[PDB]
Design a protein around this ligand. Structure first.
Ligand SMILES: Cn1nc(-c2ccccn2)cc1NC(=O)c1c(C(=O)N2CCC2)cnn1C
Ligand SMILES: [Mg+2]
Ligand SMILES: [Zn+2]
Length: 313
């Protein structure tokens, strides 16, 4: 109870910034997450023994894939932490509990293949969940771990608080399906500009939390250039493996997944920054002004990819 988690001085300061990189020391990531829960939610919101056991079961259920791994889970949780700490008074006690957990669990048991590849392979999960296939699986796996003996971090919540927090986690994890992002942001853009956006309207909060999840999920594009650039390698390592698997099904994959069309990556990043990242952090900055550093960092990395195309690197 009086056992505060503390980080070394450089991490203690840099962890508060949107562009923080959790580092290459795997064995610090759990302490970094507990640190963020303690500052974000309180030392009192989870039994430390249950939290520790939950974290380690969640780690165990991420696979050793190049990108959709335990480092991604904690990276997405830190970006959420930075949004919550810069917007203290806009979120309920339960939202602060639910969302960090939602981010840690959002890619649980990912194999490094898109929903499309599951559908074209005819994977069993594609029959169980016809849309947002992996995202429904990630939520299911989250519930599975919450029901392991001594893993129920929400045990002390009321019956209705418990249903609310699991509802927050479910919607948050579903919204990480990039197919749902486009429509969610257009709606949020209209609502903001017509001045109909109302954070007391639960359906409106749902949409805003969904945008926050897309923002945290895409947060590799908001780091220092060398983090952004080296993360892109891991992202494309999965994409190209999926491209290979598409070829094995007798299907020419999209260029994004074709390791023969490696030359087209710079332009592909421009497309992605312009079609997805920039609009996401733009709309997010309009709704949550203190998140502007994400938009600023994203724009800086766009300019870096523009420099790559111009052969200045
Ligand atoms: C959409 N798209 N298209 C190209 C592209 C197109 C043509 C040629 C080369 N590349 C690249 C991307 N996406 C990303 O690069 C990306 C994602 C992402 O889409 N997902 C889904 C799993 C995470 C996330 N973070 N980042 C940087
Ligand atoms: Mg995902
Ligand atoms: Zn993710």
């Amino acid at each position: 109870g009086l056992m505060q988690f503390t980080l070394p001085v450089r991490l203690c300061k840099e962890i508060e910034l949107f562009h923080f990189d959790i580092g290459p020391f795997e064995n610090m990531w759990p302490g970094i997450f507990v640190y963020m829960v303690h500052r974000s939610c309180g030392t009192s919101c989870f039994e430390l023994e249950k939290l520790c056991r939950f974290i380690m079961s969640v780690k165990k259920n991420y696979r050793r894939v190049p990108y959709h791994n335990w480092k991604h889970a904690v990276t997405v949780a830190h970006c959420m932490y930075a949004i919550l700490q810069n917007n203290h008074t806009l979120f309920t006690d339960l939202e602060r509990k639910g969302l960090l957990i939602a981010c840690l669990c959002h890619d649980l048991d990912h194999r490094g293949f898109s929903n499309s590849y599951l559908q074209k392979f005819d994977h069993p999960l594609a029959a169980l969940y016809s849309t947002s296939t992996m995202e429904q699986h990630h939520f299911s796996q989250t519930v599975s771990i919450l029901q392991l003996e001594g893993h129920n971090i929400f045990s002390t919540l009321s019956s209705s608080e418990y249903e609310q927090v699991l509802e927050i986690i479910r919607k948050a994890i579903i919204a990480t399906d990039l197919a749902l992002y486009f429509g969610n942001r257009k709606q949020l853009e209209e609502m903001y500009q017509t001045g109909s956006l109302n954070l007391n309207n639960q359906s409106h909060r749902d949409r805003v939390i969904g945008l926050m999840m897309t923002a945290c999920d895409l947060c590799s594009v908001t780091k220092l250039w060398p983090v952004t650039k080296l993360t892109a390698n891991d992202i494309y390592a999965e994409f190209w493996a999926e491209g290979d698997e598409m070829k094995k099904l007798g299907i020419q994959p999209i260029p994004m997944m074709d390791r023969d069309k490696k030359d087209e990556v710079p332009q592909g990043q421009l497309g992605f920054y312009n079609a997805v990242a920039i609009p996401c952090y733009t709309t997010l900055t309009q709704i949550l002004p203190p998140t502007e550093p994400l938009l600023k960092a994203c724009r800086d990395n766009l300019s870096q990819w523009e420099k790559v195309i111009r052969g200045e690197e």
